Subunit: 447 residues, 2 copies
């Protein structure tokens, strides 16, 4: 009967926040394992340093990190002892940072970055202790065995499960355990990280390893609703959603956590509750491997202001590699493609704003357009809104009738994507229409 | 401006009888004064084979093959010796270039080699006509088809062509009928060069564009475009005029007929491209025009049966960059052309372009490389059904006027939004016919 709880950077951004999170932990007596990320902001400063910065900039980042740590220390009733550990860690970072300025590598990047999670974990244990709450510190690296793919270490499930039993379970029996997420260690001892989503990933991995009954992921959203309540107030809360559906949930990956991270939990049938740390009472949503009787339609997603790139060229006809090159170009220009539809001599795609760097004002630079125009007539359309129906049995080898199609009859559709998934059916409409479409589509499918 | 250009592909000049049948079509219209020809059927391939460099043994089996085709036509002539030595001469040249190839190869050498195919057929065709007391002269396109040095895919210099055409081609056309080669050209430095697949059709267009031709006739193996495949819905009517933009989006136009890219010079210069059948000129054809009058919401529906649907699933493509870049890379490397593509959040489904690929397209080798980063699922026997038309898409979207059309059917995949002229989807084979027949009935019949 072990529950694992995970908190992201904001939940542990500072003193006040950490208490707030403690409040939530203590709330449930079954949570005995807590996985934390680095205090908000920290990981980024650490990565900036790991790149190697000249002394000046190097310390602006360093001090930044310090300021964050002490803002939490100072509020403790006995900052003395703790301050020591942090001071020690902070100095270590300063040196490694000096090193980075001379020699860099993914491996060194990991050891550096990892300190972020070590500090917050240490501090969080003090906050709880300061509440006459028995809680100990634990180094996940004692259990999180990964390969040496520094930056994106692959967890060794078997090892993890074993080591977890040898060192983690015993401590959990003594009581509450507070540990880091996102980090791990390779066989040869070097520190490693698990890439974006790491902490969420960890909470699942540890959960899988300890046959936990459930895993709570505290985010900035009360869970998923049938639709954006800001659009249709009648929007009801979805209690249980299937993994397969959640993954296809647009506003889930974007506004919530990444589906890949929960895989260890789902594959081991351990419910993942997704709630909001800024409002625990509101309840949340359970992401399960399978749900009792899955509805034909489970929810409508809305992603507004999507840019439609249409690529036209008689030369793609019967040619090999035209797209191989176009997407190559797109990748090189730091862009993630979301939707894609094709005609005989033309292809239209939308930019994935979430997986594309916000470095600038517009994703489509004349640089990219020139590279593209070089092999097709580029036409652009912005202000389109993506509307998506997440559900079940929306597609079958024998096709699907109007049961699934008639739903989109009353609207002017500019693009349709259907067939890829039996859980998703999305299309594009002009922004102006976006809300009426959603409101009407919801009314007849859920209201 | 009453200059009409006519082009005939390899089949139309495959042998003697064929060439005469083509001539019959030429003389059919008194306005055709320029005739663009491909090499006789088979030849171009043997030439390419040779250009690769073959050991003496195989090198001559292809060599001899080429010869046998040329003489099959020579022997049927009344006064053969009037051109026997020219062929003989060209054939010898080929034999040595071929020996050379076996030692040193390059696109450049490959063009000079293959070009001989068109040189021969054109020379023979001219004798067929003269043997008919028909005044017709031979002309080397290369005196006017100026291109860059991109051997294998030379880019025509329109300006140059337009100029040179006036200086050397127009003058000859005035004297009477002119028979010239297609697919080949020459670069500034004099080297022979080719225009890539479709070349002959491409030439017919460029020459037409350069001579302000009133029309261009491309004789193929189909009597033109119909509302649907006649073998599916007999009520299928023949389409007189089709807009280029529409034609390009016709699945079966590119497949059977010819490639849209090739007609570009014609369309951009508003020169109607008549597409008919050489195996039956009576049946009439279709006019591919830049624009037409009262373009219909629906112009026709196409059917491409037995398509293979490849579905790629992987939670890791979500928010990742380059997932597709790699997938398509792999696909290219394995000589596969992707036709249709549709996406969901964590999966992508595409169909293989049977025409631009080529025992089985999906080898365990490719599936291995692909499985490496996603769950591959395969479905074959699907039929592509496409609606070709106009205004099928707009910035503000389209209502049920265009959608209601496919309500009555069980659809397995839909692609819409890329083009305002096309709307296609997939359905299982079994359904294919009924779908087409019913769709046809309420849209055309
Ligand atoms: N974003 C991925 C493709 C995702 C396709 C499915 N929506 C890429 O840029 O390669
Ligand atoms: N056949 C091209 C893409 C064309 C897509 C639209 N018909 C390729 O596989 O690179
Ligand atoms: N801290 C890691 C993992 C996580 O936040 O879940 C990251 O920045 O991606």
């Amino acid at each position: 009967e072990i529950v694992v709880s995970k908190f992201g950077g904001t939940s542990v951004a500072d003193f006040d926040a950490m208490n707030r999170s403690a409040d939530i932990v203590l709330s449930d007596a079954n949570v005995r394992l807590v996985v934390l990320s680095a205090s908000a902001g920290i990981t980024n400063l650490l990565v900036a340093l790991a790149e190697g910065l000249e002394p000046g900039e190097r310390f602006e980042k360093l001090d930044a990190i310090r300021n964050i740590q002490f803002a939490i220390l100072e509020r403790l009733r006995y900052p003395n002892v703790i301050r020591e550990e942090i001071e020690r860690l902070l100095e270590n970072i300063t040196v490694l940072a000096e090193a980075a300025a001379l020699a860099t590598s993914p491996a060194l990047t990991d050891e550096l970055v990892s300190h972020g999670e070590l500090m917050s974990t240490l501090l969080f244990v003090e906050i709880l202790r300061e509440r006459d709450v028995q809680a100990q510190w634990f180094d996940v690296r004692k259990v999180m065995r990964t390969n040496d793919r520094f930056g994106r270490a692959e967890p060794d499930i078997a090892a993890l499960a074993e080591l977890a039993a040898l060192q983690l379970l015993p401590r959990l029996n003594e009581g509450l355990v507070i540990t880091q997420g996102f980090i791990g260690s390779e066989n040869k001892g070097r520190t490693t990280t698990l890439g974006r989503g790491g902490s969420d990933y960890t909470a699942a991995l540890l959960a899988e390893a300890l046959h936990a009954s459930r895993v709570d992921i505290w985010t900035d959203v009360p869970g998923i609703y049938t639709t954006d309540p800001r659009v249709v107030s009648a929007a009801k809360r979805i209690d249980e959603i299937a993994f397969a559906e959640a993954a296809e949930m647009a506003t889930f990956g974007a506004k919530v956590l990444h589906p890949a991270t929960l895989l260890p939990a789902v594959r081991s049938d351990i419910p993942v509750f997704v709630g909001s740390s800024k409002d625990p009472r509101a309840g949340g949503t359970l992401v399960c491997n399978k749900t009792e009787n899955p509805p034909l339609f489970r929810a409508l997603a809305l992603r507004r202001n999507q840019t439609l790139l249409t690529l036209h060229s008689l030369n793609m006809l019967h040619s090999r590699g035209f797209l191989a090159e176009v997407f190559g170009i797109l990748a090189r220009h730091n862009i993630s493609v979301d939707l894609i539809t094709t005609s005989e001599v033309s292809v239209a795609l939308t930019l994935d704003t979430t997986g594309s760097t916000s470095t600038g004002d517009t994703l489509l630079t004349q640089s990219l357009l020139m590279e593209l125009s070089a092999l097709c007539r580029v036409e652009v359309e912005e202000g389109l809104a993506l509307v998506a129906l997440i559900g079940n049995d929306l597609s079958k080898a024998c096709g699907v009738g109007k049961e699934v199609f008639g739903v989109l009859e009353p609207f002017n559709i500019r693009m349709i994507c259907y067939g890829a998934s039996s859980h998703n059916l999305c299309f594009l409409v002009p922004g102006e229409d976006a809300e009426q479409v959603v409101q009407k589509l919801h009314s007849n499918l859920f209201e």
